[PDB]
């Protein structure tokens, strides 16, 4: 629920997991959480460990060196959001150097409010390319994934798909997984930050990446805003005063706060004094103690260069979301932004290569001003197509328009439902020979292209057998073609797979063939 | 004399079948006149998948090549470009910090023990005593004077795989034939007793004049008959190459095995 557990300060755990009993029952740490430096620890070690009280961290969390820890499934099973008040080095979540790391385990995780994810030199580490951070960070320029098992030796990693959410970036669409056994999931935009349900029902402003209860400020699991008695509130309600930014505390806490470590100096805590009505550790400039009581007082009075790195993310099929930094040398005061953009031509060995060769899975395969902003939504757009784009910073008006050079980058809308979803019904022909030749009406418009055609026929009472067709045969067959086939009435399921993934399974067709017999 | 860094570029190589080559660098701060490295490489076993894809239909095969060929005026810039530019640096630093409390003793399925040697003066050693084609981990620690009392220095990982046994992925033996009604035949082999690495799936090219027509033969499914069965062929003296295909891609061939379709 909200208030399943106590609070603990920052902590670093080193050389053993047996202090790391110490945060046995947390739920929140008011810090941040290092575990590093496990050497003697073995993977039986990790299998009996868990921390499912620990819901939420402030700062941010830290792997590094951790010897048979194989995942994080189990250590962190509940863990849902990381306030990151505090930043490493810009990196909120870090996982370096890792060795029998093989996945992030990190389902419950659904929001890091600041900061960015750094993940390097872990050699055995897969299930790391096939996140978006988008759905989970707001700035994921900074980030690091190199050195990794999944960008050399193409891990595959694949995700449960007996189904995982598949989002698109800025020119690729691969599903999203943490392990083998959980999807990741992402929600709409409309409220990107309050949470989610699995109905898709959407949490209330209050909560922070997920709620037990839609649309309730008490049943979350945690607070967007400040926090109080059970219940997530936008803002604390007197004589209640704000502390760490996330719950409220009233005098007599952040009193005790302040006089314990005054004293006794333990880790020279912050003495948290009651300005701006919030338990903040100093009170600021132009304020003063009151050297009495800890309410603060105020004190008497005393061209240009290229664009950098233009992502691009796409939340919808007709949408894209493009985002961006100034150019490193404005040469200039930047009046307006210009951005263009085309449709590309996908590659022509794409439309007549194979696809029925390891394995069936495929890769992971005008003008506009912009003024006083680094994004911008392009709508009117072709699903999952390609789009180059090209962004240049202007610092002059119009009629002096004059400015830099064209920068470049691909984006890809999102795909649709029934794009690939094969339309009509399925037809055969007839043949004395027991041949039977296939026929079926692709969409004109796929997502991307369609690369092959799974094809499913089955007798009654028989064996499902499993076909691949690839862009030459339906070529030149226009469909494919089956030849010794025993007679009755057959069972037939067809699903095209496009640059977007596996499309959508046809309804089982039945035709008749004279049996040459009545 | 304190706790050496950790053996700067450890870099590996692909000299020959069950042999190693790793070079690497003297650590950055070795804290001493260092004495010795002590190389420690531990047999890696296979992952999930490597038993669950039915590379067959699953998707492409994930190999890790061999890294072999890893064998072999001006201005300076100003100090504001320069503190602009600074932002890895502390970074590393810290992560070294952090590495630099901790020690390595000298000590004298995923059950396979670590082998440990001393290479007293040498920034190379070859490692004669692998298995074709399979992941090895090589842990090595830059061990200085007094590395006995206080400890060797902290690992430094790196990972490497040996060269593939020449023509060993192949059928380790004699391969047999037998008709079926439908003119179906079933072929059935041995399974190499040393792979290089693994056999991942076996592909059996078969066909009229010519080995056209091909078959996918998961690691599985062999163990259903110790072979698979090709459902339907034309009636005729037909052949069939069966070349596998372990972790070091596809193999070779023993011979296009012939066999009695029609009958006389
Ligand atoms: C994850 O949740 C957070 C919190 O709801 C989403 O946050 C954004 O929240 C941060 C935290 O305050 C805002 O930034 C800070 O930005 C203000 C901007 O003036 C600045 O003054 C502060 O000093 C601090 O740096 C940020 O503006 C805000 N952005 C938006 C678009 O709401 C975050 O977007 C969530 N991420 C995902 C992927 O859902
Ligand atoms: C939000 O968190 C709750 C619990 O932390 C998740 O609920 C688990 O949810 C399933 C149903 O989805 C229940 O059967 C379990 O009992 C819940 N676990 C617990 C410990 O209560 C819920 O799924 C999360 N929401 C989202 C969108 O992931
Ligand atoms: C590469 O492998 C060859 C043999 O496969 C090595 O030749 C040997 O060199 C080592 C020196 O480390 C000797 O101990 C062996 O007795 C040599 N064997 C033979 C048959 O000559 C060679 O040293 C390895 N390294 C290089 C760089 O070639
Ligand atoms: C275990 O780890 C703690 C710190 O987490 C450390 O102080 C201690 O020396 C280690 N060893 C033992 C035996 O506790
Ligand atoms: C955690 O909770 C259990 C059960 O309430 C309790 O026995 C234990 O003492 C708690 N943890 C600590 C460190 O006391
Ligand atoms: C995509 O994100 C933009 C940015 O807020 C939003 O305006 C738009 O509605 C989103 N798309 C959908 C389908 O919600
Ligand atoms: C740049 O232009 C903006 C208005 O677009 C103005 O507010 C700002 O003062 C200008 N700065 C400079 C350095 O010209
Ligand atoms: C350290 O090494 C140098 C040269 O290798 C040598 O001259 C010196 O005597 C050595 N010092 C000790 C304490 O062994």
Redesign the pocket.
């Known amino acids: 629920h909200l208030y399943p557990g106590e609070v603990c300060p920052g902590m670093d755990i080193r050389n053993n997991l047996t202090r790391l009993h110490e945060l046995e029952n947390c739920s929140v740490i008011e810090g941040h959480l290092q575990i590093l430096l496990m050497f003697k620890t073995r993977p039986e070690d990790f299998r009996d460990l868990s921390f499912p009280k620990l819901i939420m961290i402030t700062d941010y969390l830290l792997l590094f060196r951790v010897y048979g820890l194989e995942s994080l499934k189990d250590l962190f099973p509940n863990l849902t959001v990381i306030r990151g008040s505090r930043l490493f080095f810009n990196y909120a979540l870090v996982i370096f150097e890792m060795v029998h790391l093989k996945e992030l385990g990190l389902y419950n995780l659904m929001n890091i409010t600041r900061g960015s994810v750094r993940i390097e030199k872990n050699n055995e580490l897969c299930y790391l390319a096939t996140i978006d951070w988008s759905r989970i960070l707001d700035s994921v320029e900074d980030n690091y994934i190199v050195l990794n098992k999944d960008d050399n030796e193409e891990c595959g990693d694949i995700c449960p798909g007996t189904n995982c959410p598949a989002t698109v970036i800025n020119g690729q669409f691969v599903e999203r997984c943490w392990t083998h056994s959980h999807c990741q999931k992402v929600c709409?935009?409309?409220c990107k930050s309050h949470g989610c349900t699995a109905e898709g029902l959407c949490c209330h402003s209050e909560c922070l990446g997920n709620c037990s209860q839609p649309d309730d400020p008490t049943k979350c699991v945690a607070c967007r805003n400040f926090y109080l008695d059970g219940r997530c509130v936008e803002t604390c309600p007197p004589p209640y005063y704000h502390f760490q930014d996330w719950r409220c505390v009233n005098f007599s806490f952040c009193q005790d706060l302040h006089h314990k470590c005054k004293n006794s100096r333990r880790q020279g805590c912050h003495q948290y004094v009651i300005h701006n009505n919030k338990c903040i550790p100093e009170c600021p400039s132009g304020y003063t103690m009151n050297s009495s009581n800890l309410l603060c007082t105020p004190c008497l009075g005393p061209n240009p260069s290229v664009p950098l790195d233009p992502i691009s993310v796409s939340?919808?099929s007709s949408?894209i979301?493009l985002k961006w930094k100034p150019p490193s040398d404005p040469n200039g005061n930047i009046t307006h932004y210009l951005v263009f953009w085309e449709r590309q031509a996908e590659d022509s060995e794409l439309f007549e290569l194979d696809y029925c060769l390891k394995g069936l899975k495929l890769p992971s395969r005008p003008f506009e001003k912009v003024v006083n902003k680094e994004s911008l939504?392009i709508s009117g757009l072709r699903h999952f197509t390609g789009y180059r784009i090209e962004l240049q910073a202007c610092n002059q008006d119009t009629p002096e328009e004059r400015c830099s050079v064209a920068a470049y980058v691909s984006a890809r809308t999102m795909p649709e439902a029934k794009a690939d979803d094969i339309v009509g019904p399925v037809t055969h022909e007839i043949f004395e020979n027991n041949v039977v030749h296939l026929m079926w009406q692709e969409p004109k418009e796929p997502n991307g292209l369609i690369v092959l055609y799974e094809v499913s026929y089955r007798r009654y009472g028989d064996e499902e057998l499993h076909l691949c067709v690839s862009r030459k045969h339906f070529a030149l067959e226009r469909g494919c073609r089956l030849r010794g086939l025993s007679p009755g009435n057959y069972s037939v399921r067809i699903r095209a797979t496009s640059l977007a993934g596996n499309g959508s399974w046809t309804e089982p067709t039945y035709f008749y063939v004279t049996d040459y017999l009545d | 004399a304190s706790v050496p860094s950790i053996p700067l570029d450890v870099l590996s190589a692909s000299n020959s079948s069950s042999q190693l080559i790793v070079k690497w660098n003297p650590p950055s701060l070795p804290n001493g006149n260092l004495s010795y490295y002590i190389v420690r490489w531990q047999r890696q076993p296979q992952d999930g998948y490597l038993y669950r894809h039915n590379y067959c239909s699953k998707d492409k095969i994930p190999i890790r090549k061999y890294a072999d060929g890893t064998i072999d005026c001006a201005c300076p810039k100003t100090e504001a470009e320069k503190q602009a530019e600074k932002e890895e640096a502390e970074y590393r630093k810290v992560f070294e910090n952090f590495l630099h409390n901790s020690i390595f003793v000298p000590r004298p399925e995923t059950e396979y023990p670590f082998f440990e040697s001393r290479v007293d003066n040498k920034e190379r050693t070859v490692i004669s005593n692998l298995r074709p084609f399979t992941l090895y981990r090589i842990d090595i620690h830059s061990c200085n004077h007094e590395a006995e009392k206080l400890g060797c220095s902290a690992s430094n990982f790196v990972f490497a795989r040996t060269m593939p046994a020449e023509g060993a992925d192949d059928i380790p033996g004699p391969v047999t034939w037998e008709p079926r009604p439908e003119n179906s035949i079933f072929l059935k082999w041995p399974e190499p007793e040393n792979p290089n690495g693994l056999i991942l799936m076996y592909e059996i090219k078969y066909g009229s004049q010519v080995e056209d027509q091909r078959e996918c033969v998961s690691r599985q499914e062999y163990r259903k008959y110790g072979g698979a069965k090709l459902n339907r062929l034309n009636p005729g003296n037909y052949t069939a190459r069966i070349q596998a295909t372990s972790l070091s891609g596809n193999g070779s061939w023993t011979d296009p095995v012939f066999f009695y379709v029609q009958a006389k």
Do not use: A
Request: avoid cysteine.
């Open positions: 709409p935009t409309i939340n919808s949408q979301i939504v």
